[PDB]
Write a protein that binds this ligand. Structure first.
Ligand SMILES: CC(C)(COP(=O)(O)OP(=O)(O)OC[C@H]1O[C@@H](n2cnc3c(N)ncnc32)[C@H](O)[C@@H]1OP(=O)(O)O)[C@@H](O)C(=O)NCCC(=O)NCCS
Length: 332
């Protein structure tokens, strides 16, 4: 059988689904189904500093040329009427205790995506939040100190993870998505999972950040590209001054303040306890899976095989195909 449940389990997946199903049992809703969470990709990667920053800080020996991280893809499924539905997906980047500053003991949510067919409807959002809170709960247990989120909804017609969303699934505007993450984080705060959280601007200020090299630097994130753009801005200004004869940090602080409400810095472990921690040891094995290495492969598979997630029934058929692919691609 190629069911969701028969996908190879992990500590992380097991931890998440157990949290969600305990939550569902507590709600005792007659329409809810069993939820399965599976990590379907785990691999070692590195993000390398782009030219501008390498020139400024890497060649200077002030900053590592690259940072090692593990990427994970995980999906949540719901069984209803004995039928699998994939309804939530998320890719994360995890920077371990071996990672150089400024990235060590940090996790970053690359992207998350959903299709709105969870049953019952009235528990959908709560379940998403339980997945996210459990994730923060879990990495906090392993010893990561900080979580990072870039609250950015997809542009018109773009799919983050699931090809062809339901036409009537509304896409939240920035402010709504922002409030959504806050509600999730506030729950995590009341559960003493999250210590506190701040926008990127307030965090930098409190941390007394003085140099771009101090900003966490993640694969595909907003900040490495604004830094490259900022540096080219400096170069062109320098050229203006050249003609006339014939600060990075202040550019960054300015950009940080401008877009502060989109970027969350989430403190899992703060203060002293964040300083005498054992190495991070991840009990889960690597999980090679070309289909789920970042998001393009699955979008591409979906397009190629016409797997839409645009209705409940289309989503379930697509879910079956995805699962068959995940099962066979694993098999040797
Ligand atoms: C982020 C996400 C998982 C949240 O799903 P959610 O828990 O159902 O919350 P939403 O904010 O989307 O929807 C909540 C309600 O607001 C409504 N809503 C959403 N966007 C809206 C909009 N632009 N205008 C008016 N209403 C909107 C929804 O219809 C929903 O109504 P309902 O509860 O009465 O059914 C989902 O919106 C999603 O998958 N978005 C695409 C990917 C993404 O944005 N990822 C975040 C960046 S990493």
């Amino acid at each position: 059988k190629f069911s969701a449940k028969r996908l190879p389990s992990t500590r992380l997946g097991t931890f998440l689904e157990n949290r969600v199903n305990d939550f569902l049992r507590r709600q005792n809703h007659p329409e809810s189904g069993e939820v399965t969470v599976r990590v379907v990709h785990a691999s070692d990667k590195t993000v390398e500093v782009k030219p501008g920053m390498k020139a400024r800080f890497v060649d200077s020996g002030e900053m590592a040329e690259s940072f090692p991280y593990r990427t994970k893809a995980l999906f949540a499924f719901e069984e209803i009427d004995g039928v699998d539905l994939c309804f939530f997906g998320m890719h994360v980047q995890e920077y371990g205790s071996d990672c150089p500053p400024p990235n060590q003991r940090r996790v970053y949510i690359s992207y998350l995506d959903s299709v709105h067919f969870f049953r019952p409807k009235c528990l959908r959002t709560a379940v998403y939040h339980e997945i996210l809170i459990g994730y923060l709960e879990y990495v906090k247990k392993l010893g990561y100190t900080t979580g990072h989120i870039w609250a950015c909804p997809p542009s018109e017609g773009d799919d983050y993870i699931f090809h062809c969303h339901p036409p009537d699934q509304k896409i939240p505007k920035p402010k709504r998505l922002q409030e959504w993450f806050k509600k999730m984080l506030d729950k995590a705060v009341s559960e003493r999972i999250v210590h506190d959280y701040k926008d990127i601007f307030k965090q930098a200020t409190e941390d007394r950040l003085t140099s771009a090299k101090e900003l966490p630097y993640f694969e595909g994130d907003f900040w490495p590209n604004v830094l490259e753009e900022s540096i080219k801005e400096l170069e062109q200004e320098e050229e203006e001054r050249k003609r006339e004869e014939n600060d990075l940090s202040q550019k960054l602080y300015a950009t940080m303040e401008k877009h502060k409400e989109v970027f969350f810095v989430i403190r899992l472990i703060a203060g002293p306890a964040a300083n005498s921690l054992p190495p991070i040891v991840d009990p889960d094995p690597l999980i090679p899976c070309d289909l789920m290495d970042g998001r393009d492969a699955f979008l591409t598979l979906a397009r190629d095989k016409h797997l839409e997630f645009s209705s409940l029934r289309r989503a379930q058929w697509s879910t079956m195909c995805m699962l068959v692919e995940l099962h066979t691609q694993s098999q040797d």
